[PDB]
Structures are given as C-alpha cells and as structure tokens.
Amino acid sequence: RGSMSHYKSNVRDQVFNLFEVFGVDKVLGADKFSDLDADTAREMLTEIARLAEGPIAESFVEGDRNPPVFDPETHTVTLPEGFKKSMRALFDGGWDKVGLAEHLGGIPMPRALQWALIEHILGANPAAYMYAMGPGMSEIFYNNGTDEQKKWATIAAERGWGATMVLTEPDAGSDVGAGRTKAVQQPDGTWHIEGVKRFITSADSDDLFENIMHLVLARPEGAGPGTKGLSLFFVPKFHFDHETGEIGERNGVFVTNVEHKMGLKVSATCELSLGQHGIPAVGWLVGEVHNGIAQMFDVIEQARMMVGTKAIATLSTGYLNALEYAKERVQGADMTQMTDKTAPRVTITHHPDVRRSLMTQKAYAEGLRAIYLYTATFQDAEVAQAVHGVDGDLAARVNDLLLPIVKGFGSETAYAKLTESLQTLGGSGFLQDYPIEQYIRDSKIDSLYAGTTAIQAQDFFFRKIIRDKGQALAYVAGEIEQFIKNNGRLKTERELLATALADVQGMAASLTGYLMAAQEDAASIYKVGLGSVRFLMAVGDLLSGWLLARQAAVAIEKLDAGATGADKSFYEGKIAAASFFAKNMLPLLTSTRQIIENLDNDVMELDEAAF
Amino acid sequence: MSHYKSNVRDQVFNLFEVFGVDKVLGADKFSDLDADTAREMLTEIARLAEGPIAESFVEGDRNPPVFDPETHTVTLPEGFKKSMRALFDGGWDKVGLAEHLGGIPMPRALQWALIEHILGANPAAYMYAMGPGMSEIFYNNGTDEQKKWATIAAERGWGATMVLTEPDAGSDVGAGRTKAVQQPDGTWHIEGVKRFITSADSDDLFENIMHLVLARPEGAGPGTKGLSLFFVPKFHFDHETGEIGERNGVFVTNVEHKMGLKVSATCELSLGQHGIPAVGWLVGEVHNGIAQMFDVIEQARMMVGTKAIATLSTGYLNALEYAKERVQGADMTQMTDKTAPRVTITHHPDVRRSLMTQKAYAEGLRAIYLYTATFQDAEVAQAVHGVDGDLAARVNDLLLPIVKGFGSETAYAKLTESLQTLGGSGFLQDYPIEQYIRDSKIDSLYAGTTAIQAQDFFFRKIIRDKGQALAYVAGEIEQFIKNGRLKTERELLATALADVQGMAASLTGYLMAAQEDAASIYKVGLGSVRFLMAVGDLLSGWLLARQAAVAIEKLDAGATGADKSFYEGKIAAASFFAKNMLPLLTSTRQIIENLDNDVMELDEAAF
Numbered sequence A: 001r002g003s004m005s006h007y008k009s010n011v012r013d014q015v016f017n018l019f020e021v022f023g024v025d026k027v028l029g030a031d032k033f034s035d036l037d038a039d040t041a042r043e044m045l046t047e048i049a050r051l052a053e054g055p056i057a058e059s060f061v062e063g064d065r066n067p068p069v070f071d072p073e074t075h076t077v078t079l080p081e082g083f084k085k086s087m088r089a090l091f092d093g094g095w096d097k098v099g100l101a102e103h104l105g106g107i108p109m110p111r112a113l114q115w116a117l118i119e120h121i122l123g124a125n126p127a128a129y130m131y132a133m134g135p136g137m138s139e140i141f142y143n144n145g146t147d148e149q150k151k152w153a154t155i156a157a158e159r160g161w162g163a164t165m166v167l168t169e170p171d172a173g174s175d176v177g178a179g180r181t182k183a184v185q186q187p188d189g190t191w192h193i194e195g196v197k198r199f200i201t202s203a204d205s206d207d208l209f210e211n212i213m214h215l216v217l218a219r220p221e222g223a224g225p226g227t228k229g230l231s232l233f234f235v236p237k238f239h240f241d242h243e244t245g246e247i248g249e250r251n252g253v254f255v256t257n258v259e260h261k262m263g264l265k266v267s268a269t270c271e272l273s274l275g276q277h278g279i280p281a282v283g284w285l286v287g288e289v290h291n292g293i294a295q296m297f298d299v300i301e302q303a304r305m306m307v308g309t310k311a312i313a314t315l316s317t318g319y320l321n322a323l324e325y326a327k328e329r330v331q332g333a334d335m336t337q338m339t340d341k342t343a344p345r346v347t348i349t350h351h352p353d354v355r356r357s358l359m360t361q362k363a364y365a366e367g368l369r370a371i372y373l374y375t376a377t378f379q380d381a382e383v384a385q386a387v388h389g390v391d392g393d394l395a396a397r398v399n400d401l402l403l404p405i406v407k408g409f410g411s412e413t414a415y416a417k418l419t420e421s422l423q424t425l426g427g428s429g430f431l432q433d434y435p436i437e438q439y440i441r442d443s444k445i446d447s448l449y450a451g452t453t454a455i456q457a458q459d460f461f462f463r464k465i466i467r468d469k470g471q472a473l474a475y476v477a478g479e480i481e482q483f484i485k486n487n488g489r490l491k492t493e494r495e496l497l498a499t500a501l502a503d504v505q506g507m508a509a510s511l512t513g514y515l516m517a518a519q520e521d522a523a524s525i526y527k528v529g530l531g532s533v534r535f536l537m538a539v540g541d542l543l544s545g546w547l548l549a550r551q552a553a554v555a556i557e558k559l560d561a562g563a564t565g566a567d568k569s570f571y572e573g574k575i576a577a578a579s580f581f582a583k584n585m586l587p588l589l590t591s592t593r594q595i596i597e598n599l600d601n602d603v604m605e606l607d608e609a610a611f
Numbered sequence B: 001m002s003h004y005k006s007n008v009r010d011q012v013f014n015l016f017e018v019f020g021v022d023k024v025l026g027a028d029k030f031s032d033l034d035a036d037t038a039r040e041m042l043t044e045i046a047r048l049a050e051g052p053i054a055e056s057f058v059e060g061d062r063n064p065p066v067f068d069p070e071t072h073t074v075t076l077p078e079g080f081k082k083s084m085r086a087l088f089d090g091g092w093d094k095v096g097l098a099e100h101l102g103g104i105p106m107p108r109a110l111q112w113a114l115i116e117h118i119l120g121a122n123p124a125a126y127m128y129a130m131g132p133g134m135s136e137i138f139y140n141n142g143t144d145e146q147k148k149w150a151t152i153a154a155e156r157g158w159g160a161t162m163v164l165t166e167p168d169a170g171s172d173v174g175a176g177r178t179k180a181v182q183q184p185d186g187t188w189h190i191e192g193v194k195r196f197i198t199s200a201d202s203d204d205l206f207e208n209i210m211h212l213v214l215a216r217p218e219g220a221g222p223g224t225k226g227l228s229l230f231f232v233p234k235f236h237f238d239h240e241t242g243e244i245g246e247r248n249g250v251f252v253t254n255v256e257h258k259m260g261l262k263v264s265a266t267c268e269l270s271l272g273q274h275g276i277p278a279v280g281w282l283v284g285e286v287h288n289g290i291a292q293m294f295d296v297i298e299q300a301r302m303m304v305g306t307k308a309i310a311t312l313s314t315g316y317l318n319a320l321e322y323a324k325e326r327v328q329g330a331d332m333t334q335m336t337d338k339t340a341p342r343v344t345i346t347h348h349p350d351v352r353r354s355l356m357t358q359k360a361y362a363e364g365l366r367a368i369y370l371y372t373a374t375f376q377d378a379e380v381a382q383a384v385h386g387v388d389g390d391l392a393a394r395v396n397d398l399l400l401p402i403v404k405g406f407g408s409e410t411a412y413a414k415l416t417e418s419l420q421t422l423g424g425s426g427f428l429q430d431y432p433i434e435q436y437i438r439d440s441k442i443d444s445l446y447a448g449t450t451a452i453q454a455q456d457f458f459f460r461k462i463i464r465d466k467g468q469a470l471a472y473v474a475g476e477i478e479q480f481i482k483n484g485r486l487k488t489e490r491e492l493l494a495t496a497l498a499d500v501q502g503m504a505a506s507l508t509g510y511l512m513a514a515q516e517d518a519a520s521i522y523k524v525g526l527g528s529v530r531f532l533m534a535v536g537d538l539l540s541g542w543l544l545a546r547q548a549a550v551a552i553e554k555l556d557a558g559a560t561g562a563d564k565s566f567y568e569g570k571i572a573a574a575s576f577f578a579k580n581m582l583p584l585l586t587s588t589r590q591i592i593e594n595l596d597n598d599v600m601e602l603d604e605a606a607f
C-alpha cells in the first residue's frame, strides 16, 4: 500500500528565493552563464518538477516495498523494475548531468539553480539521485586527475557511468584515518587495492550503467598513519579501453553484502571486497599524487550538500502532504464553540494546534530551503561577487562555514519536523498508505552518513570558525546586523533577531573560552564538545529566522506594490512564517545560551558504570 | 541475549526506596503479598520478557499478520503466538485482575511495573492479552447477569477490543454514526463500520473476543452523550456455561499496513453488514456509553504512555551497551595527535551528553508513571502520600495525560539519540532501535492524540478541577525545594516551578478573557501542548531530584559496588537534567506569555 503521486513540489518558492530574494538572475545571461536566461531556468525547474512528480515519484513506494535483492554468487544486485524505469526517465532527460561542466556535456548554470533542480529528484525519490551522481563524480575525478585520467573521466561522463565514494570500514567510520585497506604498488605504476569496505552506497546497481567508478581511499604500503597517510584510487568495476571506453574484463572489486535498512531501502548499501577473490582490484592513483583525504573531501563536500538538501526536500513534501490532508479533513468543532456539542464540524486547519503545527512545518521547510540556496550562492565566485559583493576567497570560506549547517542542521531539523507532518494526519499518518512514515524512515539516515551530526558540529566549530579565524562567521553576522539596523512593520521581528544574534555570539564566546581554558586544564575542551551540537543548531535557527525575515521584507514590498490573488497569499504566508518563527523559535536560543554558559564536566567525570 | 534490556533495579528503587510502596505490602487488600514476593514477580516477568516474549519481536515485524478475505480472519506469525502462549501459561494476562476474577491483589504501581516489561519486549503481546482486564471493566459496569458473563470471559481468557473510531469520528468520538436498534427480546442490533480497531481478530489465540462497541441508539441525541456501550461478542455463547455457539455478525474486513507495531492487527470492523446481525447487549442496561468507555480509555492511555517509556528504556540500554564497546576516534584532549590511542565512544562529550539525555528522560519518565500509579489505589495514596480517595483520583486524572502525552512524545524524540549513538549501524534492522522508533510513533496518536491529551489536561484536569490536583502537586514540589549538595538543583527547580506557574496563569487568562473576546480561546489551543510538555519536564526534574536525595542518603550510609554506581548515576542525572533541560522552560514561558492570533487570522491559502 502507498501513494504513487506522493511528491508535492514547490517551484514557486524556489523561484521566489532565486530571483526575488537572492537575485541569481543578475548573473544569468552573463559570463559563465551567457547562454542561460531567466526564462529558461524557470522552464527547467518546471520541467524537472513535473518529471519528479510523475515518473520519478511513481516508483518511490515500490523501491521501499520491493527492495533490491542480492545474489551473493554473482556479487550483483537486482533493483525493482519500476525504479529502473524512473532512472531511465532521469537519464533520458539529462538529469544526471545537472551542472556538469560544459566540456563533459553539461549546461553551465549557477550552483543555486543546480541544487534547486536536484531538490525535486531528492524529494520524489532520493535514491534515484544518488544512483545518478556518477557524472558529477566524473567531474571531480577530471578536476583532480592527470591529463590521461581526464580522458577517462570524459568518457565516463559521456557514457553515464555510475560511481561510489569508498571510505568506510567496520573500524573506520567517523575516524576515517583508522582505515586499513591497503594499496600495493605495481612495477607498471598501477596499484592493487586489498581490503574490505562497508556501507558503500550504490556499489552495485544492477544494469543501470555500463561501468561503475569506485573512488577508494587506501593506505599505500609504508605510508604514515591517520588521514594524512591515505591516497585516493580510481578502481573501475570493469577494466576498459582507455582510448575508446570499450568495457573489458571484470576488475577484482566485488560486493559481498547488502544491508537491511530502516529506510532508503532501494539504495543498495554494500560491503565492498577489494582483492579478496583471487582477482586484483587494480587502482590508479588519482592525479598520480598521494593526497587522498584532501581529494576525497571534494567528494565529501558535495555529498554533505546533497544530504542536507535531501532532508530539506523531504520535509517540504512532507509539509505539503500534511497541509493538503488538513485542508480536507473534517474533525471537531471550532474552539470558540467547543461547549456546543451541536456546533458545525470544521476542517482541522481551524484548530489552533494544527495551525501551530503547520506553521512550524512551513517556517522550517521554507527557512531551510532559503539556507541551502543561500549556501549555494557562495559556491560560484561569479554569483558571490554579483549577489553578495564578496571575493572568491571569502565566498569559499562562507560556503565551507554553511555546509555543516545545511547538512547537520538540515538533517536534524527535517527529521524532527516530519514528526509534526505525520501528527497532522492523526492515526492515518501511521499508515503506509500515506508517504510521511517513509519520509521519516528515509530521512533518519541523513543525520548519520556523510558524517554524523557530532562530526558536523566539530567541523563547524574547530575548522570553519576557529581555524578560519572567525572570518566567515563574522561576515554572516555582519549581514544579520545590517538587516537588523534597517518601514517599522518588522520591528518586533528585528528585535527578536537582535536577541538571537547576541545569544549566538554569546555561545560562540563561551565555547571559545572553554577552548582557551584548555591550554591550562586539558579537560576544559570537553565543554566545547558538550555544547557543539547545540551551538550548530542555534546558528541554524538564527540563519532560518534571518532568511525568513528577509523573505518577509521582500513580501511586504511586493504586497505594498499591489500583489493580488495567489501571489498575495504567497507573500502573506512569508510574513506570517517569519513572524511566527521569530516569536516561537528564536527565544529558546536565550535559554540555550545560558545552558552553554554553565556547562560543566560532571558528566565527563562520572564513572561509566553509573550510566 | 534478546533485544529487550530490562531495568528491574530502577523499578524497585522507585517502588521501595523512593515512594515506599512496600508500606502497604502485607496489609489490608495486599495482606498476602509481601515485598520479597513483589520483587520476585518483577524479576520473573522481566525474565519472561527478555526470553520468550522478546523472542518474536523481530518476527512479528518482518512477517506481519495477514488478512484472509475468504474467512474474514487474521493469521499471526507462529513465533508470536508462541510468545502469547508463554504469557498465558504463566497467568500474566491476569496481572492486576481482581481476586474474584482470578487475579493476585497488588498495588497498581506494581501492576504497571510488571506490565512495563511486556511493553518493552513485544508491546503488541500485552495488547492482545488485555482481555481479562476488559472483562473486569465489563464486570464493574455490568448488571448482575452481565457480571456472570464477564466472570466466564475472564476465566476462559477471551480477548477483547475497544471499538470507538469510525472514518469520520476519531478525535471527535461524538460524531460517530454506528447505530443500535433495540430488538423485542431486549438485545440490540448494531450496524456500522468502525476503523483502526486493535486486535479485532487474533487468529486462534482465543476462543472468543469481546468487542465493547460505542453506538448511538435509534432516537438518541447527538454527541458523546448520546452514545451507549454494547457488549458484542465474536461468537454467541451460553450465558450460563460459556459454551461457544453461533458466529455473531461482526467481521474484520481489512488489516492496515502500518509503519510499525505491525504484529498488532489493526482492523476495519464491520457490524451487521454481512447479512447476519451484530447482536449487542447494553452495558449495565443503562445508556451511559462515553462515561463507561472512559473506564477503558483511562487504562489504554496509561498503557500507551508506559509503553513509550518502556521502549525508550530498552532503547537507551541498547545504545549504552553499544557505546561501551564501540572504539572510534581519540580522546578529545588528544585531538591534535593523530597517533593518540583510540577510545571507546563513551569517552566523547557528545556521546556522554546523548547518553545522559536518554538516561535522565528514561528514568524520569519511569518515575512519572510509577508516581502516577501510586494515586490509582486509595490505600496506597493514603499510605504513601497522606491523601484521601477523592484527591487521589483527581491527581491520577491530572497525571494521566502527562504519562500518555509527555511520555509518548518524549520517548519517540529521545530514541533519536539512542539510534544516533550507534552511528550508521543504528540505521540497520540488525539492531532494534529503528523498530523501537517505528513501533513508538503510534504512541502520540492512538488513545487520543497529543493535542487531545493537552486539551484534556488543561480544560478538564485543571480548569474543571478548579486547580485542586495541580495545586497539590505544585505544593509537593515547593516543599522539596524549600527542604546543600542539591542546592543548585533546588534553585533550578524553583525557577521551573515559577515558569510553569506563569504558563498556567497566562493560559487561564486567555481562557477567561474569551468571555468578552471569543478568539482569545485560540491562544489556549496554541499553547496547550507546550504547557503539557513543560509540566512533564518539571515533574521529571523534581522526581529525578527526589531520587538524587535518596541516593545521597544511601551513599552517606555506605553504599558500595554496583549500588554505589547506581546512586552516583541518579545524582548525575538529576543535576544534568536540572541544568540542561529545565532552563528552557523560562523561554517557553515567555513564548506562551506572548502568544497572539496572527496565525489564526492568516488565510488558509497562504500556508
């Protein structure tokens, strides 16, 4: 049982952010984007949203109810037929090449538009996008490769090969540097990779593709320890003719298990055995240099952006499903007539707690969309210059700062607020007939893969703030302050934002203080760890509230100018969301600041036996 | 062993060292049950739960029940039926049952502690085993003749259902349209379709099922006050001997496909739609259906909250066991050194934060449902609290929506932390936490949604009650606060009590102001759930602080070994909860004080 047409898209909100808030249309028709105009970008969003609501979403239930089957003798996976049909619709429209470099066959576009297009695939059937990331990986291989490797990357992108990122081992998940997979140099300059990797997404994909590029982290014999000792290797499923791309003999890299998961069931998550079956796993050193963790983080950065966007896309369709249900479900009387047991029955959108729930879902779904689109505006130097006036170096540091927010805050928030979406359906929300319970199961992984929330929060504080000397964080804070410092119709929202900004500044000062104290009392560093996730989530709430308030300011201007009809309703909802978020979400940061200011190490000193 | 990890030590700590329930064991109703026998019963059912009950937890979810339209029956997986037989063969479906129906008299606090284990190990197993408890409720509401039937049903172990919901009547029970038509012989013919009925068929577990059905007699008035309650058995039977006779006209017509709790068959139930009457008997031969059914709803709400709490507890203990053995990363004090020794993940601050959050909420929630249960027996409430029967009943009624609403919501939320502790392995069906999450999502929905719990709590259990039960509990918190080692915790509790008092006053003002400005009432609705949750957090903090005060006493008296570790953990949990959970209530109070109707005035099309 399940909903075929489950996916409800929101192109209108995407276009509002892209063009009316962030002004991405400034760069369309100019420089890198000379051949792409605003009308064409809008048509592309409508087209992929239609394909996503149709053929891609059509197999969302099927992939979960009839999941992939592993044959351990052939080391291959069979995917359900309807899901492969969805994949073919993706390929036939070129949607595995969104934002691929022109020289690899893509259409040049700003990253903000690229991720808005991808949002639709991730909301309709996110595993379909994951299987379709091969050309994107080919582009990363190209950028990191030798001249000869760039030839192979060009073939792979043209032919649409699939791809995997192969880091994790049973003893090396968060601690990538603990990996033991080894690389043995051959006299001809190739390497033989030996080891067993775990949890590898898409490591086999039935007959979707002619080949799969495994990008594998391994430790050359005699290399040093930790991440710094790791190198990155191109390990193709099949050998091939490096001149023509013609597929050759099977390379020694074999799936040996497929996990049984809570959700994302149609994404084959695989134990991957390299050189264990009497056939060498030949690998080629990427770029013919030993620089593996740096190279692989080109991939990780994109995966983390995808995972946060996936969480956000899923909350959005969860909200729209809940809203559509609530508009039609009649239950109970209006609260003003509660005592009159003869009173007319009302649709549940008339109930305060349902409106509370729906506005909570709305404000977070729309605030998160704003966050990932804002982040993407720093991923092209030309867009960052045109829309923000920031140079390429600062833009890169701002993007790096925001990625743990997209991934960590996005994943955690989306899963939490889908609870409200399900609750809106009542008992029916617990049924597989409706898609919210699968959204919940499919999104639980988003706080775990591509680096757990705790790893995101440690990255955010230690690398993206401390190692950055606070430059990116100071830039964003300065933009929030400028908004606050400027019609008095958003006065209370600006005051609530000023309090939230000062709360987050207070948190940052407190955690920085603990870090400095650790120069003298090493254990003081634990308090940074204790507060790190709460700090990451606070910055996300602050950014959400600020971006919603910017959206409200645009909406006020459009209403003042004379918006009517569905436009008017849209703008009215932005004002209501920004106000609701400021009044109901932001004040909690004040208590969180005080909690962070009072952290102590009692919980660290407690005997493990006492838990 | 199995997936289910029990915590009899914490139950006994609460029952005996905190609340003093052993004070009533050996006296009056409980003349024949002593403290040692109570502890042995808890250990024994915990072992049953960890063993044969938990054994089919996975099987029930992976090989769920099948509806057969050829016979209008449901088939259950064989391994789950084996677990059910283990429950029946030890008499555990008679826990809390009246002595005249074959039970062992015991405090409700002990009853729910026993039930917690079955709810942790395989909650649908307890649901199918609720028949005797329902027979006792029928007994209590029945005529003298119906008491005879209820006695038979209890003795023979028949199953039971509570049959309220319809497609257009879930939260709004009073909108139900199922009809009851009186026959010349005084029976009734029940006609209608009910939805989402738990255990409406149960394969060959039982020889009969008692359906307790709400229906509206021809000519009755509208709403819940027009409803009556009917005894509608799956099979007719001899009212004297119990011998099973002809099939009655009450048939399951579908089984829902659910996120979790899959082995609980959740059925569309058709009454008098298959060409044979669904014969019902009016309960008590009086028309008083919603009041009668609330005897059942109260028990169901207590069960659902205890279920959620039981599940968080085994989630936590599974996560803890995993974390103690998982090696990953270096100690944070050696971050810079990429050669540092690897540590188990309990050494990482975020994992300790997560584990203490799970622990504090799991143990606070346990305290809350056991505290609640100490007001469910007049004799216990008198002995341990010094409160009379009338106030005990009102305090129990005040706390039930906390157990249900705050328990269900908190448990599901904090299981997120349990699963996170496992890392990527938590997303695997190899470990039980993802099933705990799926199975516990329903707890915020059936037996009344959280919103309905919060509206019950405020409108009925506070306003209609004139605040008497709420003032009693607040007075006990105040006394604890006013009473050295717990001075910081008492100060934080004082802030939280004042915060909850302010929320209650704001919401009351919004309600009373509705006399002159009708829309004012919407602000009560907007704040109701946050208020319910805030009270739950306050009660958690207070009860944890009371546990910490006992632990300090026991440590000063010379506790050693595993006792000492246990008491140290209680001190740590109370302190952590006071410092990291209670302060948020200050911001929630300010938010509630600032509620406005903008979100109610917004056009629906703007969402």
Ligand SMILES: CCCCCCCCCCCCCCCCCC(=O)SCCNC(=O)CCNC(=O)[C@H](O)C(C)(C)COP(=O)(O)OP(=O)(O)OC[C@H]1O[C@@H](n2cnc3c(N)ncnc32)[C@H](O)[C@@H]1OP(=O)(O)O
Binding pocket: A130, A131, A133, A134, A136, A137, A163, A164, A165, A167, A168, A173, A174, A175, A176, A177, A201, A202, A226, A227, A228, A293, A294, A297, A299, A300, A301, A302, A303, A307, A449, A450, A451, A452, A455, A459, A463, B338
């Ligand atoms: C749009 C198209 C895109 C297409 C992409 C292609 C897709 C291919 C197919 C895959 C698609 C399927 C989707 C799968 C999604 C799930 C993916 C996974 O889980 S996969 C598994 C996911 N697994 C994880 O995500 C691992 C989670 N664990 C961590 O992230 C750890 O913190 C750790 C491993 C970094 C610690 O190791 P430790 O040694 O203490 O680390 P240190 O702090 O000392 O840094 C050392 C060096 O690392 C560097 N570098 C470090 N940080 C960053 C950064 N933020 N940022 C950048 N670079 C960073 C840096 O070089 C640094 O050197 P330096 O510049 O300082 O000199």
Ligand SMILES: CCCCCCCCCCCCCCCCCC(=O)SCCNC(=O)CCNC(=O)[C@H](O)C(C)(C)COP(=O)(O)OP(=O)(O)OC[C@H]1O[C@@H](n2cnc3c(N)ncnc32)[C@H](O)[C@@H]1OP(=O)(O)O
Binding pocket: A341, B096, B127, B130, B131, B132, B133, B134, B160, B161, B162, B164, B165, B170, B171, B172, B173, B174, B198, B199, B223, B224, B225, B290, B291, B294, B296, B297, B299, B300, B304, B446, B447, B448, B449, B452, B456, B460
């Ligand atoms: C341990 C042994 C246990 C054995 C148990 C055996 C169980 C056998 C079956 C086993 C399977 C069942 C387990 C499965 C768990 C899920 C079961 C369900 O969902 S089932 C479906 C669960 N469905 C639900 O839970 C329905 C959710 N909906 C509600 O609760 C609504 O608020 C409503 C229907 C009450 C509103 O109707 P509205 O007419 O506006 O209400 P008003 O405010 O105007 O009150 C009218 C009358 O109702 C009365 N009464 C009311 N409240 C209480 C109370 N707290 N308290 C007491 N009584 C209460 C009261 O008589 C009052 O009259 P008065 O005293 O004032 O004169």
Ligand SMILES: Cc1cc2nc3c(=O)[nH]c(=O)nc-3n(C[C@H](O)[C@H](O)[C@H](O)COP(=O)(O)OP(=O)(O)OC[C@H]3O[C@@H](n4cnc5c(N)ncnc54)[C@H](O)[C@@H]3O)c2cc1C
Binding pocket: A164, A165, A166, A167, A168, A170, A172, A173, A174, A175, A198, A199, A200, A201, A202, A264, A269, A445, A448, A449, A450, A451, A452, A453, A454, A455, B326, B327, B328, B329, B330, B345, B348, B349, B350, B351, B420, B421, B422, B423, B424, B425, B427
């Ligand atoms: C569905 C799925 C798909 C995946 N896809 C891929 C893939 O395609 N390629 C790939 O290489 N990997 C992939 N992974 C692996 C995934 O990235 C890891 O599961 C993740 O990094 C966590 O590692 P772990 O499971 O070993 O958990 P652990 O690292 O053992 O973490 C367990 C717990 O300890 C905490 N913890 C660990 N270290 C620290 C620390 N230093 N400080 C604080 N807390 C800490 C974690 O936050 C977590 O709560 C996938 C995993 C899943 C579940």
Ligand SMILES: Cc1cc2nc3c(=O)[nH]c(=O)nc-3n(C[C@H](O)[C@H](O)[C@H](O)COP(=O)(O)OP(=O)(O)OC[C@H]3O[C@@H](n4cnc5c(N)ncnc54)[C@H](O)[C@@H]3O)c2cc1C
Binding pocket: A329, A331, A332, A333, A348, A351, A352, A353, A354, A423, A424, A425, A426, A427, A428, A430, B161, B162, B163, B164, B165, B167, B169, B170, B171, B172, B195, B196, B197, B198, B199, B258, B261, B266, B442, B445, B446, B447, B448, B449, B450, B451, B452
């Ligand atoms: C697994 C399962 C088993 C069940 N078992 C049984 C059983 O054995 N017997 C039985 O009789 N029923 C049973 N139920 C029915 C269950 O109690 C109802 O689903 C529940 O009461 C909610 O009703 P509903 O599904 O019609 O949701 P709705 O009442 O339609 O609620 C939808 C949404 O509106 C909100 N809402 C509704 N009215 C109000 C209001 N006045 N004010 C504010 N918000 C409001 C709800 O909170 C929810 O968010 C079961 C349900 C499930 C899911």
Ligand SMILES: [Mg+2]
Binding pocket: A387, A388, A389, A390, A479
């Ligand atoms: Mg700027």
Ligand SMILES: [Mg+2]
Binding pocket: B384, B385, B386, B387, B476
């Ligand atoms: Mg007392």
